[PDB]
Amino acid sequence: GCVEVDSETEAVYGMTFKILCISCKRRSETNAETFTEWTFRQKGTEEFVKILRYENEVLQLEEDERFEGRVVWNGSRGTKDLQDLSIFITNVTYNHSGDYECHVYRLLFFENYEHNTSVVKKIHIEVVDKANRDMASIVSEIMMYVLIVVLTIWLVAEMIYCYKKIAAATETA
């Protein structure tokens, strides 16, 4: 089943990065004919330029040079009922930092009814020079060592105490 996950927000310079855009239908059993368009406002500017449009299983790329090459479809294949609209950058550069817009245009087909829907997803992408470990993993590892050591110490302390008491009471008689 479809699950809306959010994309990561930090790409390593020079490497490859996949931008996630997932939009599930409310009821999975229906039919649709989805198509998508992406726009991108580069950090330092205020306007969104269209970069790509993916309709009818053919991706037509805009005439932009920032994304000339360097980007390939990585969404749903050969369906026309497109639920994952993700794109993938190859050779990320600094110019690819800013806001992204994932316009999803869906046309649900019903009994006698045709509903033209639309959704928007905003993603913020920051290009760093080398990967940064997420604070969550760090503090978790740290606390997971702290707990181990404190348990061991508590146990050993209580053990030495009890053992002294036992050695005492042994030869008391």
Q: Under the rule (CB under 8 A), what is the footprint of other proteins?
A: 1-6, 22, 24-30, 76, 83-84, 106, 108, 110-113, 115, 117, 134, 136-137, 140-141, 143-144, 147-148, 151, 155, 158-159, 162-163, 166-167, 170
Whole-angstrom CA distances from 39 to 1, 48, 103, 172 are 28, 5, 8, 85
CB proximity list for 101: less than 8 A, separation 6 or greater: 38, 39, 40, 41, 48, 120, 121, 122, 123
For the CB of residue 58, give the shortest distance to other proteins in the complex, in Å.
20
**Which CB atom, from 83 or from 97, has the smaller least distance to other proteins?**
83
Instruction: Give the tokens for residue 10.
Output: 């930090």
**Which CB atom, from 32 or from 49, has the smaller least distance to other proteins?**
32
**Which CB atom, from 11 or from 98, has the smaller least distance to other proteins?**
11
For the CB of residue 56, give the shortest distance to other proteins in the complex, in Å.
19
